[PDB]
Amino acid sequence: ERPTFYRQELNKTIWEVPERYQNLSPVGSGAYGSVCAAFDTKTGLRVAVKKLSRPFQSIIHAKRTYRELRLLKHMKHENVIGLLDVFTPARSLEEFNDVYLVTHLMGADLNNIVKCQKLTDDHVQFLIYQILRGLKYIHSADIIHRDLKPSNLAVNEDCELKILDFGLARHTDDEMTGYVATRWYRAPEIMLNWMHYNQTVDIWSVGCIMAELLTGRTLFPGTDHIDQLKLILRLVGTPGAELLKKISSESARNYIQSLTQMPKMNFANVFIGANPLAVDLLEKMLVLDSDKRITAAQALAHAYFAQYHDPDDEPVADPYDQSFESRDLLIDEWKSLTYDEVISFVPPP
Numbered sequence: 001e002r003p004t005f006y007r008q009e010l011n012k013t014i015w016e017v018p019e020r021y022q023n024l025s026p027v028g029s030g031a032y033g034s035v036c037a038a039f040d041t042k043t044g045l046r047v048a049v050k051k052l053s054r055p056f057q058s059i060i061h062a063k064r065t066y067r068e069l070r071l072l073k074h075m076k077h078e079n080v081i082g083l084l085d086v087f088t089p090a091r092s093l094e095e096f097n098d099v100y101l102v103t104h105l106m107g108a109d110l111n112n113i114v115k116c117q118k119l120t121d122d123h124v125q126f127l128i129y130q131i132l133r134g135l136k137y138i139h140s141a142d143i144i145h146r147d148l149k150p151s152n153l154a155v156n157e158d159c160e161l162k163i164l165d166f167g168l169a170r171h172t173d174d175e176m177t178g179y180v181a182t183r184w185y186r187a188p189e190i191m192l193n194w195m196h197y198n199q200t201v202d203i204w205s206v207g208c209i210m211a212e213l214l215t216g217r218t219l220f221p222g223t224d225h226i227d228q229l230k231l232i233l234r235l236v237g238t239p240g241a242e243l244l245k246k247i248s249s250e251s252a253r254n255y256i257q258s259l260t261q262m263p264k265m266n267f268a269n270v271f272i273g274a275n276p277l278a279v280d281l282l283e284k285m286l287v288l289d290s291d292k293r294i295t296a297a298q299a300l301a302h303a304y305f306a307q308y309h310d311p312d313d314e315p316v317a318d319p320y321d322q323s324f325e326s327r328d329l330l331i332d333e334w335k336s337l338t339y340d341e342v343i344s345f346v347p348p349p
């Protein structure tokens with residue numbers, strides 16, 4: 001049953017959405033798509049509506065649109081962005097050219113929180129608990145966020161948290177250059193392309209975020225990739241032979257070996273006054289060798305979270321088939337796959 005759609009121009013972009021969505025108001029714009037806040041009269045929810053930008057413009061864009069839609073349709077967890085609705089005004093595959101994604105409206109991110117509020121140790125426990133709870137879920141489906149930073153973590157007035165803006169495409173080189181938050185939370189192996197990276201890249205970002213919640217300050221605010229690596233090695237120590245061997249990039253390996261060796265610092269002397277259990281956890285997250293970092297499931301059982309940990313309420317995700325990542329398809333094939341996923345969507349309760 002096709003709802004009735006209505007048309008409006010919001011910032012020289014035409015929005016064609018079902019009647020249920022009212023009071024559309026531009027809230028953001030990028031190469032990803034334009035975003036509007038709206039009121040969903042059907043559910044009574046304040047929602048964010050994203051209009052994808054030229055979703056089927058190239059093979060790469062079509063595959064990306066399919067990827068984003070597949071990912072959002074899968075994620076069903078309190079601490080992870082989920083999909084309330086997806087629609088298109090198209091009546092057939094032949095006229096299908098726009099995809100609109102509907103989610104909860106977020107308002108505030110953790111960037112806003114860290115800047116404008118005093119976070120007690122109890123707040124840090126709760127906020128980091130939820131991130132790890134969501135990441136246990138995401139990682140259980142072999143999904144890596146890759147881009148966790150405070151601006152990608154929405155927090156409501158009750159300090160309730162959702163993970164959003166999954167890394168879906170390489171940032172440009174320019175975007176990662178210089179004194180920029182876009183790089184400060186990245187694991188060094190991914191920042192410098194040391195090796196085939198894994199899901200603990202996300203645990204590294206959690207360590208950086210947790211530290212910032214505790215001190216109110218960026219942990220590794222490098223002025224460039226190399227300055228940042230130096231900030232990192234100063235804290236955690238220069239790599240040993242065992243990690244060196246795992247750096248498959250001969251060039252990177254040769255560079256790190258040029259550095260004066262440095263021991264890991266005392267974290268109690270960096271995080272002065274912090275809960276000793278918070279310090280212990282940071283030590284387990286901020287490990288250079290990604291093989292040896294604590295995982296999300298392991299971290300949830302750490303004594304730091306004794307107050308919030310409930311092993312019966314830390315769910316894993318349904319299996320997630322990402323074999324499409326391996327296919328080279330034509331635009332029209334990606335578009336048809338995307339169409340199927342739009343028309344098969346079932347809203348949550």
Ligand SMILES: Cc1nnc(-c2ccc(C)c(-c3ccc(C(=O)Nc4cccc(C#N)c4)cc3)c2)o1
Nearest residue numbers: 027037048049050068101103105106107164165166
């Ligand atoms: C991959 C992937 N990971 N997340 C997505 C995704 C998809 C759709 C939406 C709508 C969103 C999304 C959800 C919420 C918001 C949001 O509430 N933005 C915002 C920003 C600033 C102010 C206001 C307000 N009022 C609202 C923006 C975007 C994210 O895709």
